[PDB]
RNA sequence: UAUAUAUA
């Protein structure tokens, strides 16, 4: 059920749920998949929720990076809406070479558990450097950094601002 | 310094 639900992101708009299930079919059988198509706007969300009848598939799903239709995705465990609401996403800048995405997650962890943190790098053409994306289990953690606009990370201070629309 | 992730 929902407990076995997985979150899929970084999916090619052309990507279809059928390919999704087929892609993750190797792992087993999917009980409920949600690529999150957008027949209205005409463009899919680009991410979906994948569920498996057997939770075992989920364990293996995270082990692999996952490359679908020439794109890269990061399948992660689904987060309950109530818990999801508590969490938030902030924007960070001042990220460069030697930053290491792993260090980025541990770096921000100092002021928050950090449910998830990434450099985006959808195409690995630049998002990986320059700025970063961090998610916090609690909104309160975000406030800590708000007070701390500049943090000593790579010994060059970074500027952090609450998440904003792509505009 | 920007999300084809958190589904209106």
CATH number at residue A139: 3.30.70.330
How many whole angstroms separate alpha carbon A3 and alpha carbon A28? 16
Boundary (domain end) residue, out of A56, A86, A116 = A86
Tell me the backbone φ, ψ of residue A125, rounded to 5 degrees: -110, 0
Nearest CA among A6, A134, A19 for reference residue A60: A6
- Candidates A80, A75, A72; CA nearest to A27 is A75
State which protein residues have CB closer than 7 Å to strand B: A 7-14, 34, 36, 44-47, 49, 71, 73-79, 84, 89, 91, 93, 115-116, 120, 122, 126-127, 130-131, 133, 135, 159, 161, 163-166
- Cβ pair A92, A105 in contact under 8 A: no
Residue where one domain finishes, among candidates A69, A86, A103: A86
Distance between CA atoms of residues A76 and A22, nearest Å: 18
How many angstroms separate the CA atoms of A167 and A165, rounded? 5
Token digits of residue A76: 């992660």
Positions of E strands within chain A: 5-8, 30-34, 48-52, 67-68, 71-72, 76-77, 88-95, 116-118, 130-136, 150-151, 158-162
Q: Are residues A61 and A121 in the same domain?
A: no
Query: ∠ CA(A138), CA(A139), CA(A145), 5° rounding?
Result: 105
- Residues A149, A160 contacting (CB under 8 angstroms): yes
The two counts, helices (H) then strands (E), for chain A are 5, 11
Q: Are residues A11 and A72 in the same domain?
A: yes
Q: How many domains does chain A have?
A: 2
Look at phi and psi of residue A45 and say left if phi exceeds 0, alpha if psi is from -120 to 50, else beta. alpha
């Amino acid at each position: 059920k929902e407990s076995c639900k997985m979150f899929i992101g970084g999916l090619n708009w052309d990507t279809t749920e059928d390919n999704l299930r087929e892609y993750f079919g190797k792992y087993g059988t999917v009980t409920d998949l949600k690529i999150m198509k957008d027949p209205a706007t005409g463009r899919s969300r680009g991410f979906g929720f994948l569920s498996f009848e057997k939770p075992s598939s989920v364990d293996e799903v995270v082990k692999t990076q996952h490359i679908l239709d020439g794109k890269v995705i990061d399948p992660k465990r689904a987060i309950p809406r109530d818990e999801q609401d508590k969490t938030g996403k902030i924007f960070v800048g001042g990220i460069g070479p030697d930053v290491r995405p792993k260090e980025f997650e541990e770096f921000f962890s100092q002021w928050g558990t950090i449910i998830d943190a990434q450099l985006m790098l959808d195409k690995d053409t630049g998002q990986s450097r320059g700025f970063g994306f961090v998610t916090y289990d609690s909104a309160d953690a975000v406030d800590r950094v708000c007070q701390n606009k500049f943090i000593d990370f790579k010994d060059r201070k970074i500027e952090i601002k609450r998440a904003e629309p792509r505009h």
